[PDB]
Amino acid sequence: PAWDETNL
Amino acid sequence: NLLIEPARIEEEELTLTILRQTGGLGISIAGGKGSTPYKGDDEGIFISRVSEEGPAARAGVRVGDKLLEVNGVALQGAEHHEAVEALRGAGTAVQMRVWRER
Numbered sequence: 001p002a003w004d005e006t007n008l
Numbered sequence: 009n010l011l012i013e014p015a016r017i018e019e020e021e022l023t024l025t026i027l028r029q030t031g032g033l034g035i036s037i038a039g040g041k042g043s044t045p046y047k048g049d050d051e052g053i054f055i056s057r058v059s060e061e062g063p064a065a066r067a068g069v070r071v072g073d074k075l076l077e078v079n080g081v082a083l084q085g086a087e088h089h090e091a092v093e094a095l096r097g098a099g100t101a102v103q104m105r106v107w108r109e110r
Contacts, residue, residue, distance in 0.1 A: 001044050003044040003046045007035075008037065008092070008095050
């Protein structure tokens with residue numbers, strides 16, 4: 001998968 | 009006359025302090041143990057995005073910065089969701105130690 005991204 | 013190369017940073021460890029606002033910290037993070045690396049085979053936590061005029065931009069954070077530690081919490085070997093939880097619960101002032109390459 002693509003790498004995970006989380007907004008903070 | 010011929011030009012000499014100016015001084016040039018190749019690598020850098022920094023300590024930055026973000027002041028949270030109602031919208032958050034103005035960053036996105038990527039990577040972590042168990043998930044797909046942000047960069048090559050490095051499973052560390054990385055800054056993937058900085059809001060242009062956001063709190064982290066003000067504090068000097070940059071895309072690609074590798075996150076090493078947050079308010080005394082070491083992120084070595086951290087899973088993606090563990091770093092997210094440390095950051096969402098970091099409070100008003102988020103001081104972080106980062107590794108930065110050119």
